[PDB]
Design a binder for this molecule. Structure first.
Ligand code: 7U5
Lengths: 276, 977
């Protein structure tokens, strides 16, 4: 009626390592739980993992003299009845600082009615085509990563060049400004004597300096727009990666479900080795 | 890149324009090697051809400033440097009156060339914590330097030539038996003044004789205050008083059955080489509060606009900000979210509420958050994907609970990481300012809230606060591995029995995990226990430093166990890991960094590798500033070693530039043209000048001399590595070896290989210490940058593929060993091939390294076997045995019936004894991997990956069930045996 066999239990998951249980309780609501065989592999241990307060609480079930329970008094006939007892009353009884009522079990039957083509050939055929999508899609992401990282280095290299240009410009322009400062007292005396060469030659250096100053600023000016194009192309690569990533998770998650599913229904993975 | 921006090739003469003080523009044509002194000379002897000459009046009183490629202005006091190696951004020069000390910033140029970035950059950092570290960390620099001047020049020598001793005066029995009645025969060489001729003095002495009496009695056979002992070949000295067998060099000779021949050196000859060290303090060194526990309020944080997120307005529906208070890796409360909003207007004017009170916040609390994109499609699916992350400390380094507005620049999501938050991540803002930005705002409590001092905490404890027969459960928990599961009953059991735990000191890592950190009542009681806890072994206190234990008092206690127990021998072994747990440190000024830095500045072996381990991670923008500040402190006070570290850095750049040209621009040419390119490039005077007469990064005691260009080819494998050959400068090179070969690899990650070889060396040390002589070969490997590194070369070794190709089958390998060493020695070859082949079957299986084949498995002529190119480990019970039919024939000495031979069953006997020996020390191997999770290695990103080793060691099963698990794997992979 309620206390059916532990095998025919939605929450009981058998022998799944702790790592698998973590991926199945990750970012789930407070009160999620599932049961599995203790990690030691000894018979009749049945660790209970509960998700309370962001953390994965891990309460152990003791089995002595054909009885089960958390604390010393194992006043319970079987795991199913113990779970159902605490599935209706909060665990504050066992632990005063533990207030959750085993609300959302992680049922293994829910995963069952999401798959299709239960036969042995369609699974391999459908699974084979996902792998083609997975490898081609996965490699697609990896190639973009190379552009994203290679693009990042070029942007940083250009940015440092801009700083160097700024320093160079300030050095050049400051000298020009220093030109007049020093060319204030000698200029009057030079003007008095009608020496065309001194006026022209002084302007000759000054004229050359203006070309250098102007030429340098042009170099920085052009390089900046080159960076902006790189910066723009950089963001675009970021957009593609973000819109590709969830596809990889979705494809890989469904892809592995079938690969794991093939083993469950009495199929040896040697044949799946060549199916790919 | 190159001498000038854009063009790496440097024409000998270039038009260089000067900026004279008056305002006169002049151009000069100079040489690549034209030093600054000459250029200024010729520069000033051409102003006579220009308008104004009345200001110069002389050539001195100028500094010859210019602009460097790093985009910073350099004053160029050091007039000696040739124009070639100035790294000028653009060819142009300016003349100014000298300003500054000229001593603090002739050094700041050498400091900033080794670190790889200008020292002036730390001056523009306005962070109050960055500038307090630069000033306060100089206390350790003074004490370390002062300690180096305590007794004599002798204290100076101990810094430069640290005794390479072992932490075990007592010898393992199996090696002690190698001595004939507890005595060892050594050869002593004395150099004679006429023509510097050599003498040989064979000598027999007890193993436990200090170097002092070895020298004295060696004089008797010759027929005090001088004549220190030295190792022929490399630069190793026996200065400190230890038993002669204590030293690493002497012990190995005993193991390998070699004659330990040494040299006698006049004491004042070594002291003369010692340079005078002067550590001058840098310029910068001279430059209402309510307690947290009186704030009756809950934690509240407000999110505001996020500047920009790179998403597509169609492939993604909405975005939200996911936050959560964390203490280490575990949440202190339940994660909170913000309302989904369109990915066009990320505003979020929300006030997130957290289920934790302000007074309950632990000191090491952090606020992790990320920007996630919710899809919410596919009929009945809603998949989340993070777009950026960022963590914030809730208390600044001064113990002040942050408050007010704050702008945080988010980081990219790490490759292969799929969880929404990244609590295992560096706290701080992204240095790059063109990334997503998120404005927060922490509520204001009308004051500055400071975390309560220890005296207040100690009172909260001891205020709210016999033996047990079933204390065998405490011993049961203590022996469990770090990653083992602890249940709610065990956590509640340890805490209740906390006061009786101090009789089990090694129970601390478990007792700290069974404490509620979001409850100041329990935490204040843990502080009062950690204060009186007994000391624990360094190999256990060294796991209180990884990411699981962020509390400053717990991490401070661990570093007090390292100080008083960690010997300089073990620090040199676990240094790769102690550097990595510097990235988990809460703030810049730790108690660990002060301990690590003091060791580096007091021991030049640790200093050399301390430098290269930090310097090899400066490309990471996440830890570039933290490690860059630390490298500057070391380089400032490291002594004269900065001149040796500058030659190694310069030599490695010449090789990186050379290799980039080969593998980047013209990779598609034939090898002969590629080979002819190398010889012309390596034959240039500058390249030959930078690549000679420097210490080797792999072993600072090996000094590399003239380069043997004839036998420096380009490997045809991998990414075309570089096989380079050098020579031993010292006269007695033939006694150690004549050439240092080194593979320079640029292109593949070497930090997977450099941790595998560290684990192999630790295994081989466990087996030797116990009863076994499984001789492994953990050659040298060092990563010096971003996917560039150095690999030693093992002399006289051929890959299994080479022996097969030149052998003509399956008896070829066994015949080849027979050919090389015939006679009575043949037994040792088969005995050594078996001991070495047994170790690499166990080490390969436990770590699950990539699959071996004939190309990456080598064998020395003597018979020893070793592996190379450990591509990946732990990824790619799911790894069979590497052994095959070729090696079985050698094991059984050619017998066709290999499985059922007496020899083979002996091979299996030491495969089991080896596996059970490592299984006992699984605690050490779970930490060495667990301290590298933030290291960034692709296959070691989470505690999930370290679960593979917990499976191949059968840590959950019983000692007997694990042994059966190994036997099943051994036989199954070989289809019976
Ligand atoms: C048919 C023509 N030949 C080839 O096509 C290949 C075959 C080939 C590849 C690879 C290794 C190897 C290796 C190796 C790698 C990592 C190691 N890590 C630790 C210890 N030992 C290691 C040894 C051997 C052999 N020849 C080379 O590429 C090559 C280049 C430069 C050389 N220059 C000298 C000085 C010498 C002695 N031989 C050279 C071999």
């Amino acid at each position: 009626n309620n206390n059916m066999s532990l095998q025919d239990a939605e929450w009981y998951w058998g022998d799944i390592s702790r790592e698998e249980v973590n991926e199945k309780l990750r970012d789930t609501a407070d009160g999620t739980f599932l049961v599995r065989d203790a990690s030691t592999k000894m018979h009749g241990d049945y660790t209970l993992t509960l998700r309370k307060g962001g953390n994965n609480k891990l309460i152990k079930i003791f089995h002595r003299d054909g009885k089960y329970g958390f604390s010393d008094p194992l006043t319970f006939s079987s795991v199913v009845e113990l779970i159902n007892h605490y599935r209706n009353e909060s665990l504050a009884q066992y632990n005063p600082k533990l207030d959750v009522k085993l609300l959302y079990p992680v049922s293994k039957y829910q995963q069952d009615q999401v798959v299709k083509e239960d036969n042995i050939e369609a699974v391999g055929k459908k699974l084979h085509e996902y792998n083609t999508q997975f490898q081609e899609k996965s490699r697609e992401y990896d190639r973009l990563y190379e552009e994203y990282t290679r693009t990042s280095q070029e942007i940083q290299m250009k940015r440092t060049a801009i700083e160097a240009f700024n320093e160079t410009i300030k050095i050049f322009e400051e000298q020009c400004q220093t030109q007049e400062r020093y060319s204030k007292e000698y200029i009057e005396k030079f003007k008095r004597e009608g020496n065309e060469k001194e006026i022209q030659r002084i302007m000759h250096n000054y004229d050359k300096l203006k070309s250098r100053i102007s030429e340098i600023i042009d170099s920085r000016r052009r390089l900046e727009e080159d960076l902006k194009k790189q910066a723009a192309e950089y963001r675009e690569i970021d957009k593609r990666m973000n819109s590709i990533k969830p596809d990889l998770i979705q494809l890989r998650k469904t892809r592995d479900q079938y690969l794991m599913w093939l083993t469950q229904k009495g199929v040896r993975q040697k044949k799946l080795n060549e199916w790919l | 890149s190159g001498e000038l921006w854009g063009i790496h090739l440097m024409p000998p003469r270039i038009l260089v324009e000067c900026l004279l003080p008056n305002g006169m523009i002049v151009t000069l044509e100079c040489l690549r090697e034209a030093t600054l002194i000459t250029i200024k000379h010729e520069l000033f002897k051409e102003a006579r051809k220009y308008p104004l000459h009345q200001l110069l009046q002389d050539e001195s009183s100028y500094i010859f400033v210019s602009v460097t490629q790093e985009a910073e202005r350099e004053e160029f006091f050091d007039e000696t440097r040739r124009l070639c190696d100035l790294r000028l951004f653009q060819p142009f020069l300016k003349v100014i009156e000298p300003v500054g000390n000229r001593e603090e910033k002739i050094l700041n140029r050498e400091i900033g060339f080794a670190i790889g970035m200008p020292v002036c950059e730390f001056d523009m950092v306005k962070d109050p914590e960055v500038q307090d570290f630069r000033r306060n960390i100089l206390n350790v620099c003074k004490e370390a330097v002062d300690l180096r001047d305590l007794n004599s020049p002798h204290s100076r020598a101990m810094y430069v030539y640290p005794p390479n001793v072992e932490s075990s005066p007592e010898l393992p029995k199996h090696i002690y038996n190698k001595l004939d009645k507890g005595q060892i025969i050594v050869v002593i060489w004395v150099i004679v003044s006429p023509n510097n001729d050599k003498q040989k003095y064979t000598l027999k002495i007890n193993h436990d004789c200090v170097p002092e009496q070895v020298i004295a009695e060696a004089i008797r056979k010759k027929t005090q205050g001088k004549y220190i002992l030295k190792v022929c070949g490399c630069d190793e000295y026996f200065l400190e008083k230890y038993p002669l067998s204590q030293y690493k060099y002497i012990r190995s000779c005993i193991m390998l059955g070699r004659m330990p021949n040494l040299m006698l050196m006049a004491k004042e000859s070594l002291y003369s080489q010692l340079p005078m060290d002067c550590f001058t303090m840098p310029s910068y060194s001279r430059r209402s509060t309510k307690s947290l526990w009186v704030i009756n309020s809950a934690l509240r944080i407000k999110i505001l606009c996020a500047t920009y997120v790179n998403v597509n307005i169609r492939d993604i529906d909405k975005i939200y900000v996911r936050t959560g208070i964390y203490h280490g890796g575990e949440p202190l409360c339940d994660n909170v979210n913000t309302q989904r909003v369109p990915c066009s207007n990320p505003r979020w004017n929300e006030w997130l509420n957290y289920d934790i009170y302000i007074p309950d916040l632990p000191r090491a609390a952090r606020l992790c958050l990320s920007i996630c994109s919710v899809k919410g499609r596919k009929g009945a699916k809603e998949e989340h994907c993070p777009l950026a992350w960022g963590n914030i400390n809730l208390f600044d380094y001064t113990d002040t609970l942050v408050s007010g507005k704050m702008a945080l620049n988010l980081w990219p999501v790490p490759h292969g990481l799929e969880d929404l938050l990244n609590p295992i991540g560096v706290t701080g803002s992204n240095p790059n300012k063109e990334t997503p930005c998120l404005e927060l705002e922490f509520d204001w409590f009308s004051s500055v809230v400071k975390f309560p001092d220890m005296s207040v905490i100690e009172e909260h404890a001891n205020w709210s606060v016999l033996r047990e027969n079933d204390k065998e459960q405490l011993k049961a928990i203590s022996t469990r591995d770090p990653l083992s599961e602890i249940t709610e009953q065990e956590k509640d059991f340890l805490w209740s029995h906390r006061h009786y735990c101090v009789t089990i000191p090694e129970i601390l890592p478990k007792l700290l995990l069974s404490v509620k950190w979001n409850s100041r009542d329990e935490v204040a009681q843990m502080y009062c226990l950690v204060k009186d806890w007994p000391p624990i072994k360094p190999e256990q206190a060294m796991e209180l430093l990884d990411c699981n234990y962020p509390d400053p008092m717990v991490r401070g206690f661990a570093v007090r166990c390292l100080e008083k127990y960690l010997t300089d021998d073990k620090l040199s072994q676990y240094l790769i890991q102690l550097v990595q747990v510097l990235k988990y440190e809460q703030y810049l000024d730790n108690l660990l960094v002060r301990f690590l830095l003091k060791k580096a500045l007091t021991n030049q072996r640790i200093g050399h590798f301390f430098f290269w381990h930090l310097k090899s991670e400066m490309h990471n923008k996440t830890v570039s500033q933290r490690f860059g500040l630390l490298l500057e402190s070391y380089c400032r006070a490291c002594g004269m070693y900065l001149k040796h570290l500058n030659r190694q850095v310069e030599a490695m750049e010449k090789l990186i530039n050379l290799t980039d040209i080969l593998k980047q621009e013209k990779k598609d040419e034939t090898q002969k043209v590629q080979m002819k390119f190398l010889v012309e490039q390596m034959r240039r005077p500058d390249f030959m000048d930078a690549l000679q007469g420097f210490l080797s990064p792999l072993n600072p005691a090996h000094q590399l001399g003239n380069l043997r260009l004839e036998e420096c080819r380009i490997m045809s494998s991998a990414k075309r590595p570089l096989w380079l050959n050098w020579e031993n400068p010292d006269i007695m090179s033939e006694l150690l070896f004549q050439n240092n070969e080194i593979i320079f690899k640029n292109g593949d990650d070497l930090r997977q290989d450099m941790l595998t070889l560290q684990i192999i060396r630790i295994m081989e040390n466990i087996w030797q210490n116990q009863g076994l002589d499984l001789r492994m070969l953990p050659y040298g490997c060092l990563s010096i940058g971003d996917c560039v590194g150095l690999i030693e070369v093992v002399r006289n070794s051929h890959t299994i593929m080479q022996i097969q190709c030149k052998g003509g089958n399956s008896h070829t390998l066994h015949q080849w060993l027979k050919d090389k060493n015939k006679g009575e020695i043949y037994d040792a070859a088969i005995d050594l091939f078996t001991r070495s082949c047994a170790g690499y079957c166990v080490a390969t299986f436990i770590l699950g390294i990539g699959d071996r084949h004939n190309s990456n498995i080598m064998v020395k002529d003597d018979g020893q076997l070793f592996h190379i190119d450990f591509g990946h480990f732990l990824d790619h019970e799911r790894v069979p045995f590497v052994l095959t039919q070729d090696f079985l024939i050698v094991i059984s000495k050619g017998a066709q019936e290999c499985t059922k031979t007496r020899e083979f069953e002996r091979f299996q006997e030491m495969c089991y004894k080896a596996y059970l020996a490592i299984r006992q020390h699984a605690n050490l191997f779970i930490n060495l991997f667990s301290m590298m999770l933030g290291s960034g290695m692709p296959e070691l990103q989470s505690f999930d990956d370290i679960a593979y080793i917990r499976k191949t060691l059968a840590l959950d099963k019983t000692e007997q069930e694990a042994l059966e698990y190994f036997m099943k794997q051994m036989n199954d992979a070989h289809h019976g045996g």
